[PDB]
Design an enzyme around this catalytic site. Structure first.
Site, PDB file in Angstrom:
ATOM      1  N   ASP A  21       0.802  -1.208   0.000  1.00 33.15           N
ATOM      2  CA  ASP A  21       0.000   0.000   0.000  1.00 33.15           C
ATOM      3  C   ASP A  21       0.851   1.281   0.000  1.00 33.15           C
ATOM      4  O   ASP A  21       1.201   1.814   1.053  1.00 33.15           O
ATOM      5  CB  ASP A  21      -0.977  -0.025   1.190  1.00 33.15           C
ATOM      6  CG  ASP A  21      -1.972   1.124   1.164  1.00 33.15           C
ATOM      7  OD1 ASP A  21      -1.823   2.032   0.312  1.00 33.15           O
ATOM      8  OD2 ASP A  21      -2.923   1.099   1.984  1.00 33.15           O
ATOM      9  N   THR A  22       1.157   1.771  -1.198  1.00 32.90           N
ATOM     10  CA  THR A  22       1.964   2.969  -1.354  1.00 32.90           C
ATOM     11  C   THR A  22       1.310   4.239  -0.781  1.00 32.90           C
ATOM     12  O   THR A  22       2.014   5.226  -0.513  1.00 32.90           O
ATOM     13  CB  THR A  22       2.352   3.198  -2.824  1.00 32.90           C
ATOM     14  OG1 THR A  22       1.170   3.457  -3.605  1.00 32.90           O
ATOM     15  CG2 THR A  22       3.076   1.972  -3.382  1.00 32.90           C
ATOM     16  N   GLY A  23      -0.011   4.192  -0.568  1.00 29.81           N
ATOM     17  CA  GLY A  23      -0.752   5.293   0.072  1.00 29.81           C
ATOM     18  C   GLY A  23      -0.732   5.305   1.602  1.00 29.81           C
ATOM     19  O   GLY A  23      -1.270   6.212   2.220  1.00 29.81           O
TER      20      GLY A  23
HETATM   21  C1  LIG Z   1      -6.137   7.111   2.125  1.00 32.79           C
HETATM   22  C2  LIG Z   1      -4.623   7.062   2.340  1.00 32.79           C
HETATM   23  C3  LIG Z   1      -4.006   8.463   2.303  1.00 32.79           C
HETATM   24  C4  LIG Z   1      -4.222   6.306   3.618  1.00 32.79           C
HETATM   25  N1  LIG Z   1      -4.866   4.967   3.699  1.00 32.79           N
HETATM   26  C5  LIG Z   1      -4.138   3.987   2.857  1.00 32.79           C
HETATM   27  C6  LIG Z   1      -5.007   3.575   1.651  1.00 32.79           C
HETATM   28  O1  LIG Z   1      -4.253   2.822   0.681  1.00 32.79           O
HETATM   29  C7  LIG Z   1      -6.253   2.795   2.059  1.00 32.79           C
HETATM   30  C8  LIG Z   1      -5.992   1.319   2.384  1.00 32.79           C
HETATM   31  C9  LIG Z   1      -7.251   0.616   2.816  1.00 32.79           C
HETATM   32  C10 LIG Z   1      -7.677  -0.512   2.103  1.00 32.79           C
HETATM   33  C11 LIG Z   1      -8.833  -1.184   2.490  1.00 32.79           C
HETATM   34  C12 LIG Z   1      -9.562  -0.737   3.585  1.00 32.79           C
HETATM   35  C13 LIG Z   1      -9.125   0.380   4.303  1.00 32.79           C
HETATM   36  C14 LIG Z   1      -7.970   1.058   3.925  1.00 32.79           C
HETATM   37  N2  LIG Z   1      -7.093   2.773   0.875  1.00 32.79           N
HETATM   38  C15 LIG Z   1      -8.267   3.395   0.800  1.00 32.79           C
HETATM   39  O2  LIG Z   1      -8.786   4.069   1.695  1.00 32.79           O
HETATM   40  O3  LIG Z   1      -8.922   3.227  -0.485  1.00 32.79           O
HETATM   41  C16 LIG Z   1     -10.289   3.566  -0.590  1.00 32.79           C
HETATM   42  C17 LIG Z   1     -10.397   3.983  -2.042  1.00 32.79           C
HETATM   43  O4  LIG Z   1     -10.867   2.848  -2.759  1.00 32.79           O
HETATM   44  C18 LIG Z   1     -11.222   1.774  -1.887  1.00 32.79           C
HETATM   45  O5  LIG Z   1     -10.224   0.751  -1.972  1.00 32.79           O
HETATM   46  C19 LIG Z   1      -9.931   0.224  -0.680  1.00 32.79           C
HETATM   47  C20 LIG Z   1     -10.527   1.191   0.329  1.00 32.79           C
HETATM   48  C21 LIG Z   1     -11.144   2.316  -0.481  1.00 32.79           C
HETATM   49  S1  LIG Z   1      -5.133   4.454   5.231  1.00 32.79           S
HETATM   50  O6  LIG Z   1      -5.644   3.116   5.193  1.00 32.79           O
HETATM   51  O7  LIG Z   1      -6.115   5.326   5.789  1.00 32.79           O
HETATM   52  C22 LIG Z   1      -3.815   4.468   6.156  1.00 32.79           C
HETATM   53  C23 LIG Z   1      -3.485   5.608   6.892  1.00 32.79           C
HETATM   54  C24 LIG Z   1      -2.337   5.625   7.693  1.00 32.79           C
HETATM   55  C25 LIG Z   1      -1.519   4.498   7.771  1.00 32.79           C
HETATM   56  N3  LIG Z   1      -0.413   4.519   8.562  1.00 32.79           N
HETATM   57  C26 LIG Z   1      -1.851   3.350   7.050  1.00 32.79           C
HETATM   58  C27 LIG Z   1      -2.999   3.336   6.253  1.00 32.79           C
END
Ligand SMILES: CC(C)CN(C[C@@H](O)[C@H](Cc1ccccc1)NC(=O)O[C@H]1CO[C@H]2OCC[C@H]21)S(=O)(=O)c1ccc(N)cc1
Lengths: 99, 99
Positions: free
Chosen positions: B25-27
């Protein structure tokens, strides 16, 4: 280009005539941008992440230029804290993870 | 190896003697795993995503094997919906984005 991950993988994007910064996000299924006017038809939708869910507007077949690569795809608009480029658009610009 | 993004970039990890699946997870700045017993000292912490914040336990200098690459770093444990490998560990396995 190739990018390391010591810093957030932020890139410039151009969408709806506007220039923004957005995160290349391999953990996001979908692209989600903070509040902006995208012209045209949209549909209500809910997406979930860490901390729960947000309500978004789903715009289809939107043109985006990501670091000079054009893609057309679904863009979600809503109260995300950060503009995120998700796999739906990453695939179109031929973005890969390598290690 | 090199990984395209047509599907979620899920990998096998081994941590605390246990085998799990986790998303590259690059995000994500940080690595966050769902509830598990990590042995040792932790500190309370809060992290935010889309939808808001979760409370996590922060474990430092934890060994993880990610697709056969060993890394030692901080692991957060808490009610994330998905095991996510974030940049703190991605950098250690030499993971890059390319397009
Ligand atoms: C939104 C980002 C700036 C940060 N997020 C990482 C991100 O990759 C999450 C990772 C993620 C993945 C699944 C469930 C929750 C979080 N993805 C996400 O929110 O994607 C959304 C957009 O499309 C959908 O795809 C999956 C969730 C939806 S995060 O999960 O909130 C996060 C924040 C801080 C840390 N340390 C680790 C992770």
């Amino acid at each position: 280009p190739q990018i390391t991950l010591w810093q957030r993988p932020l890139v410039t994007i151009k969408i709806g005539g506007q220039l923004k910064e957005a995160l290349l996000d391999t953990g996001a299924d979908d692209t989600v941008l903070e509040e902006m006017n995208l012209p045209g038809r949209w549909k209500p939708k809910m997406i979930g992440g860490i901390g729960g869910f947000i309500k978004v507007r789903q715009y289809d077949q939107i043109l985006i230029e990501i670091c000079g690569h054009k893609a057309i795809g679904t863009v979600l608009v809503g109260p995300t804290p950060v503009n995120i480029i998700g796999r739906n658009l990453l695939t179109q610009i031929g973005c890969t993870l390598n290690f």
